[PDB]
């Protein structure tokens, strides 16, 4: 009747089989590129 006090609930084996990573993207994979932010450069589109 050894469990007169208590014993810790054992851990199960939770295996992720599906694909729950379908909305994320690693920053170390697709790093963000530059975009303008107010310091617009010259309108050099003044061709010959």
């Amino acid at each position: 009747g050894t469990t007169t006090g208590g014993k810790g609930e054992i851990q199960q084996i939770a295996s992720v089989n599906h694909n729950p990573d379908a909305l994320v993207l690693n920053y170390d994979d697709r790093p963000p590129e530059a975009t303008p932010n107010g310091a617009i450069l010259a309108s050099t589109q003044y061709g010959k």
Binding site: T4, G6, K7, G8, E9
Partner: protein, 436 residues
């Protein structure tokens, strides 16, 4: 111009604020932590749930550490709105905390009321009331589930989560006493309410599941947790006379480093009644009209802030026969003490004297060690009960040293002391560092 005009305005008096900077406000670094999870698990309740019955539970060990404990009750209204007052609190008459067969602490329904009166506040207090009473003018026959959280040291902070995992050879139990009667639920004053339902009870414990390394350390290492305990005794009140000012010297049979003392005067007839009854709005059943009586409270408004109905005129605490502080008025303990030490509002009839800078917190901040005091005494002077409670003018226009004639109903006194002890855990067993 703009914010830059402030930065440039820099001189000698800025050096003591920003020279050789140590910190910033714009770079908070958050500390990485261990891997854990919390699960709310229903416990087995042994015994028989009902009014006046005792029940108990052995906390299961599903997780490794425990914190919050909530007792759920299902109660029904035996009368209309305004006839109950924190009925779940009245019902939970007392709770004992036991480890390995040894009592660690014990709280009482009155303590839960006193604790709340002093330490909860604002919306916390309101939400707290929502979980223990009917606050939307519910009517007779209404049924509601109440949640009464326990307030033992491990039930207030994860910091003191009880290491059940390190207590392998000690069972941990809670023992409960349910009140024989609960106002507005199964009795209306002394009259039983026919057909009143028995309560349904459920006890829930929130367990912490630790990952491998943290869990292993808790399981194998000895621990010392600085914890709180509640000391409490009931005493007869030197009930004030309607002819004079009663006085009393109550020896305080307390021990250990005490964070604070707290007390109240009450009428055991009505749970939570710490003040006199009166024919002023909220101070009695029917107050404000022809049907008003000062023998029965407005239960839904049992607690007040109207100190005219309180009975303590003044008090001092003696230690080893020496005054600890100059004698102060009852309103000093009721209003200033908690202003300084808690920051909430304390109801009339409830008093606090802190030996600590911040008694509302966990971190020790000064204590009175009664284990070195042979004569700790609470000296109380009561107000004269000469005011005709049935005449609102008599009450509302009265003086500092007097109270209601109905204040003589406050014949019982509850004195509490909250102290610090150490819960030591080693080799699968625990115990307290100090017995006395």
């Amino acid at each position: 111009a703009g914010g830059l005009s402030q930065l440039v305005a820099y001189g000698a008096q800025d050096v003591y604020l920003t020279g050789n900077p140590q910190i910033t406000f714009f770079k908070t670094v958050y500390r990485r932590y261990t891997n854990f999870a919390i699960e709310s698990i229903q416990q087995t309740i042994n015994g028989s749930v009902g009014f006046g019955n005792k029940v108990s539970t052995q906390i299961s060990r599903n997780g490794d550490l425990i914190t919050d404990i909530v007792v759920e009750f299902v109660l029904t209204k035996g009368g209309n709105g305004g006839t109950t007052y924190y009925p779940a609190e009245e019902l939970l008459q007392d709770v004992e905390l036991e480890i390995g067969g040894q009592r660690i602490d014990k709280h009482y329904n009155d303590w839960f009321r006193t604790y709340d009166a002093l330490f909860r506040m604002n919306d916390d207090r309101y939400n707290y009331r929502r979980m223990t009473d009917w606050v939307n003018n519910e009517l007779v026959g209404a049924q509601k589930r109440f949640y009464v959280p326990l307030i033992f040291f491990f039930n207030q902070t994860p910091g003191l989560a009880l290491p059940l995992i390190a207590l392998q050879y000690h069972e941990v139990k809670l023992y409960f006493t349910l009140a024989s009667q609960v106002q507005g639920v199964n009795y209306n004053g002394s009259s039983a309410i026919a057909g009143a339902a028995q309560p349904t009870m459920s006890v829930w414990v929130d367990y912490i599941f630790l990952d491998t390394q943290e869990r292993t350390r808790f399981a194998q290492l000895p621990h010392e947790y600085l914890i709180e305990q509640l000391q409490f005794t009931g005493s007869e009140t030197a009930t004030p006379s309607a002819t004079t000012q009663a006085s009393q010297n109550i020896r305080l049979n307390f021990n250990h480093p005490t964070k604070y003392l707290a007390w109240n005067f009450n009428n055991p007839t009505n749970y939570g009644q710490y003040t006199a009854l009166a024919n002023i709005p909220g101070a009695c059943s029917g107050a404000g009209t022809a049907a008003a009586t000062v023998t029965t409270p407005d239960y839904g408004n049992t607690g007040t802030y109207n100190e005219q109905l309180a009975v303590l005129d003044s008090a001092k605490i003696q230690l080893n026969g020496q005054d600890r502080f100059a004698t102060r008025k009852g309103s000093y303990f009721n209003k200033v003490q908690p202003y300084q030490s808690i920051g909430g509002v304390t109801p009339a009839g409830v008093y606090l004297y802190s030996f600590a800078l911040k008694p509302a917190g966990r971190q020790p901040s000064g204590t009175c060690n009664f284990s070195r005091i042979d004569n700790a005494t609470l000296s109380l002077t009561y107000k004269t009960c000469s005011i005709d409670a049935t005449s609102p003018a008599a009450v509302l226009g009265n003086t500092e040293t007097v109270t209601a004639n109905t204040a003589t109903l406050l014949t019982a006194l509850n004195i509490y002391a909250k102290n610090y002890n150490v819960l030591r855990i080693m080799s699968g067993m625990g115990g307290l560092a100090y017995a006395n």
